């Protein structure tokens, strides 16, 4: 429409990498040798159009090192593919549980670099009146040196007042990460993303890349859970993996103190992704 960074029909599909809500994903090497990701959205065009578009406009501002950068698009012959830099390491979750991935796990540092990294990611978008609405471990791809990049903006929204927008639309996002307040009320703010971040935060600490797992007890919502631990019941150090005695006693009391601050019942008492990004670094600092 207003754009012309628009590539056109490559090859025939070499079944690869991913699968998506509305669409598929393929790893396709370009004419210039570039490793590029392709999010073909021809499977079930169940309003897969508005999302596709919002992801073109909201993302054609592709100017950040903590967001997945879009190369091109295609609306030619009913198809609607999207093109991105291939991400060597897949999403963050695939490094926190999922299945496989040799060389054991991530460090606490590597975990914090990726927690802080991801934060600038959101903070930025909150600076630009952008709510992501769907912040989660799967949406935080990593590249060759494990640098975090946000993705799937399709559900995202933009604000007028630039930051202080307290707008309201239809409820959307991943069932465990969704702001409960947002859910129960409908009023959407930029903090609803802060909540969702608090969730990822622990999802990094714990490796309970389950967030919402329906098999243990009423300890099912990692959000409801790590809260009842570090908010009051025990400051539990028992929630994490074979992370060992690697985390300092002090950085850990911060890292969580914040993650809990992110999950406050009302957005009111949450911290703007600004503080959260400072506190994060501060704990990585507290550690070494």
């Amino acid at each position: 429409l207003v754009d012309l960074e628009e590539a056109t029909n490559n090859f025939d599909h070499k079944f690869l990498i991913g699968h998506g809500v509305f669409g598929k994903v393929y790893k396709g090497v370009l004419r210039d040798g570039a490793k590029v990701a392709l999010k073909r959205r021809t499977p079930e065009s169940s309003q897969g159009i508005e999302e596709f578009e919002t992801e073109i406009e909201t993302l054609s501002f592709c100017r950040h090192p903590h967001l997945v950068s879009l190369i091109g698009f295609c609306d030619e012959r009913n198809e609607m593919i999207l093109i991105y830099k291939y991400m060597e390491n897949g999403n963050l979750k695939r490094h926190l549980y999922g299945s496989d991935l040799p060389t054991m796990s991530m460090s606490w540092e590597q975990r914090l670099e990726i927690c802080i990294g991801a934060a600038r990611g959101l903070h930025y978008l909150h600076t630009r009146a952008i709510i992501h609405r769907d912040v989660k471990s799967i949406n935080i791809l990593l590249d060759e040196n494990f640098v975090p990049k946000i993705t799937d903006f399709g559900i995202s929204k933009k604000g007028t007042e630039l930051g202080q927008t307290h707008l309201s639309t239809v409820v959307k996002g991943t069932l465990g990460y969704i702001d409960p307040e947002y859910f129960i009320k409908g009023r959407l703010t930029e903090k609803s993303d802060v909540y969702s971040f608090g969730v990822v935060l622990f999802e990094v600490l714990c490796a309970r890349s389950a967030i919402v797992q329906s098999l243990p007890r009423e300890m099912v919502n990692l959000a409801e859970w790590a809260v009842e631990s570090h908010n009051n019941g025990q400051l539990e150090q028992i929630v994490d993996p074979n992370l060992a005695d690697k985390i300092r006693p002090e950085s850990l009391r911060k890292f969580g103190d914040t993650a809990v601050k992110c999950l406050a019942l009302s957005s009111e008492d949450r911290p703007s992704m600004g503080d959260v990004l400072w506190k994060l670094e501060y704990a990585l600092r507290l550690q070494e």
């Binding site: 809500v21 409820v171 991943t174 069932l175 465990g176 919402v212 099912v220 959000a223």
Partner: protein
């Protein structure tokens, strides 16, 4: 039971004008663990049957949820 219960919910959806085809799309999205986008109609029908839906939310193995997925799929035909 569960098949008896599931039907009650497909009924509401249809009786409350809810396009049940779409409702199925969200129940798939919900159980898979994919970004959901319920309508006002659909979302309040569900919270009655899945109370902890805001937090816990339609599991894979939740009997009723499995039944409802089918109970809808059939009715779509």
């Amino acid at each position: 039971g569960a098949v008896a219960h599931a039907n009650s919910i497909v009924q509401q959806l249809v009786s409350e004008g809810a396009d049940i085809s779409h409702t199925r799309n969200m129940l798939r999205n919900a159980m898979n663990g994919d970004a959901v986008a319920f309508s006002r109609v659909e979302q309040n029908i569900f919270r009655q049957h899945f109370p902890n839906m805001p937090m816990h939310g339609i599991s894979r193995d939740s009997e009723l949820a499995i039944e409802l997925r089918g109970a809808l799929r059939r009715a779509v035909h």
